């Protein structure tokens, strides 16, 4: 059955209602809580190339939604808008009443294309996509989510800032996927797994503050050369339209 978290002897333990002694008192449903916990807290890689490999398309499995009452402030969230090469949408529109995750420091918005060989996009490790107090087994189009898992417990009786980071993708959800961090509609940077959100923000600031944006109508793509842990515990520009940035 679904496990239940109860504190005994100053330690959190799993014990369902059938395994409770008479000393345990449940005086109202208010003591019962459903909570959502972010995969970030377990040390998973939260960069866009790593996160997307954890998601895949599948058919024949109906989506399911379960609610939770309280969640964790996230550092990294994701907002996907993916189409097939012929232009058809890959992800379903968000059902009525399903809003994005309410607390994200960085929202990684990804627009791109891929084969999308499946009706719905699931989590390959079995985790959930956390929306506003609703957890789904599938990804919804254009809706901010955090990867996470749900717990159920018996209880014993700085402002909010969000920054959007935009990416372009080709061959999404495949063994050969390419990403570009977007500075504007015509200026892009080739993206690597090492690039933290703070590094991307400072890269964007540097490019703007001294004039590396595309001054033509063509697509200017930069590159950060290789010469350049957990979030809670912590240059020269040349053009070779590809380019380089030591």
């Amino acid at each position: 059955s679904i496990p239940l978290g109860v504190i005994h002897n100053s330690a959190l333990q799993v014990s369902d209602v059938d395994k409770l002694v008479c000393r345990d008192k449940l005086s109202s449903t208010n003591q019962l809580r459903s909570v959502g916990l972010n995969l970030e807290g377990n040390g998973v890689a939260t960069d866009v190339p790593s996160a997307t490999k954890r998601w895949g398309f599948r058919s024949g499995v109906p989506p399911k939604v379960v609610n939770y009452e309280a969640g964790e402030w996230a550092e990294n969230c994701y907002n996907l808008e993916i189409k097939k090469p012929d232009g058809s949408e890959c992800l379903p529109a968000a059902p009525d009443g399903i809003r994005g995750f309410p607390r994200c420091r960085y929202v990684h918005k990804v627009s791109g294309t891929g084969p999308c060989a499946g009706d719905f996009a699931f989590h390959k490790e079995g985790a959930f996509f956390l929306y506003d107090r609703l957890a789904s087994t599938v990804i919804y189009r254009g809706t901010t989510f955090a990867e996470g898992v749900v717990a159920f417990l018996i209880l014993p009786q700085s402002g909010y800032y969000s920054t959007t980071i935009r990416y372009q993708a080709t061959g999404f959800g495949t063994n050969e996927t390419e990403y570009l961090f977007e500075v504007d509609n015509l200026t892009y940077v080739q993206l690597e797994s090492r690039f933290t959100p703070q590094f991307l923000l400072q890269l964007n600031e540097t490019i703007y503050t001294s004039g590396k944006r595309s001054n033509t109508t063509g697509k200017l793509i930069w590159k950060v050369n290789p010469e350049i842990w957990a979030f809670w515990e912590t240059l020269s520009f040349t053009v070779v339209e590809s380019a380089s940035s030591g």
Partner: protein, 120 residues
């Protein structure tokens, strides 16, 4: 069973968001036409790893996933809201679903305060 955290990392601090159901209003703020939008209904709190609660909590949610997913596979409800209510009912049935035999391990009736009244 005891919860053993088997994760590569554990953020020992929990910066959480939730909603205030009682939400003691200030004037007309409870009226939906005058009240906050969907983005401003949240309260926040911070919780440290006393008793190892946070690290156990992350492990507990990780281990809940398999049973939760199997429950969601077997159900036909599109959105499930009744898991906690059904566990409150199961709590009461385990104790009061049959005849309560006083002084039995499975009957949660303490006659001590009154067993002195007779013998006095």
């Amino acid at each position: 069973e005891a919860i053993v955290n088997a994760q590569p990392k554990c953020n020992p601090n929990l910066h959480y968001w939730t909603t205030q159901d009682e939400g003691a209003a200030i004037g007309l703020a409870w009226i939906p036409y005058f009240g906050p939008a969907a983005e401003g209904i949240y309260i926040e709190g911070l919780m440290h790893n006393q008793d190892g609660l946070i690290c156990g909590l992350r492990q507990l949610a990780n281990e809940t996933t398999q049973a939760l997913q199997l429950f969601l596979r077997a159900t036909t409800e599109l959105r499930t809201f009744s898991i906690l209510n059904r566990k409150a009912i199961d709590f009461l049935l385990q104790r009061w679903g049959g005849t309560c035999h006083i002084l039995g391990p499975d009957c949660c009736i303490e006659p001590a305060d009154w067993t002195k009244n007779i013998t006095d």
